[model samples]
Target: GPEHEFVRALIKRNCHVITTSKGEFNMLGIHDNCAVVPTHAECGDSVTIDGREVRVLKQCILTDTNDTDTEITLLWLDQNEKFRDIRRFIPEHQREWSNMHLATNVTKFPMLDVEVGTVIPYGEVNLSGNPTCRLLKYNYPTKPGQCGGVIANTGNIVAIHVGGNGRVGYGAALLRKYFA
Candidate 1:
């Protein structure tokens, strides 16, 4: 299936722990030696990924002035994960043509939910919600929700999961603050 192959693409297959003192959320590989995690949980000063110590540099929380921030985090290590390359990050695109109606739209693209390692398809995107997030059609509870695990499709980072228990995530396009 497309989702299956898509899963194989982004997964680094390291299958290692970043940290568990707070919770086991997922992180994505980006930058030369950086990984972005969820800001919902505090990584504190730093955390260990697969035995490698890393720093929690920033968390793009919902700021009043910035209309497109969420519970996203920024971290760095000696190595980046599978989904590297900021050039492929979102606004490199999706949902740019559905503004004429409600936040609800059909996401034909099969999405993969990449967790600490157990990546899989959750559901289809339906609600646009706000400029910052889009909601999935699934109603079941998931452990990876609220974590900063990124949602992927096509060939790059699409959006970073922020809330809605695996149902909502922030489109990568709106997450340019970390680099700027």
Candidate 2:
């Protein structure tokens, strides 16, 4: 039904798979030369994406525990490389895209809601920023390399996968960060 199609569309359009030499993993592209946001696991000083290496322009090392000590990472691709899932990144022309969202700005949220967003599942995080960031219960484990995968279903990338605690994984909201 529409459910299956939704995933197909997401993968085809926004999901930028970054399989590797030693193994495989990935993050989404927000621009022709950059990803929406990434964790620290794979994308280091200059991480390799699908064999091509990109510069890590920015990242998060926060002051709070809510963010889980994780935030966003900006990777700059070679100008020559233009990917389908990502659009051109022109400072002035590119508008700010909030592909992610914060579950709650409030101090807390007890209401349990089923995740409508998409996700496969990871480790490491910086939920220190969002006190409301909660652990999402799933049927699997938050494996090592899965740390940087985007978690979403329909609207925006609901969250980015950063996990632990066996069946429940810790993930933050998904959204693109922009800079000049």
Candidate 3:
């Protein structure tokens, strides 16, 4: 009766019941190679990239994701420094997913800049500037700077921003959780 109750509870939770053989199950192990380095800084002056005025705030690097030699950075914008409005820049349909309640827009650029210090944020930001900046990957259907190309991960602080609410997403927590 206890086993039956447990089964019923799972079903009530909408959990799938794998009635098939154990061999049919596909187990996936963790094989990620991502490292996040968060930093901080005051809102720096604007810099022109490809004739675009991009304000530099914080800066950081994401390394070892899908490869041993890849780094991604976030550069916050000065003029357009708002969370809700930054979604227009994200590559792919990340904006839609982010717009939903599933995942909120996290942070803007300059997530962590060594020039200032390490300052983490609470959510994601618009990465639209990455692709067009040329420091990241070129094309993959995502926004200009959404998905950093393979080589773009080669250690480059790409994004920058101002001082409001901004941050970098470090993988250390997730890694620790998995290990713990």
RMSD list, candidates in order: 9.2, 10.5, 21.4
Per-residue lDDT over 1-180 for candidate 2, one digit per residue giving the tens place of the 0 to 100 score: 443344445555544544434344445556566564434344556656545666656544432244444454555655465545422222222122222221211012211123322232233333434332333324444544555455543344445555444555566444333333
**CA error at residue 149 for candidate 1, angstroms:** 2.5
Which window of ten consecutive residues has the lowest lDDT sum in model 2? 104-113
Candidate 1: stretches off by over 4 Å: 13-16, 55-69, 78-83, 92-141, 144-146, 165-180
**TM-score per candidate, in order?**
0.56, 0.53, 0.21
How would you order the candidates by lDDT, starting with the best?
1, 2, 3
Model 3 over residues 1-180: C-alpha lDDT tens digits? 443333233222211111111111100111121112121211124434323445456333333333221223333434332222211222321111111100011122111111222222223322323111112211112221211111111111222221121232221111222111
RMSD of 3: 21.4
Write down the lDDT that model 2 would get.
Answer: 0.43
Point out the worst 10-residue segment of candidate 3 by lDDT. Answer: 95-104
lDDT of 3: 0.22
Off by over 4 Å in 3: 1-46, 65-68, 83-180
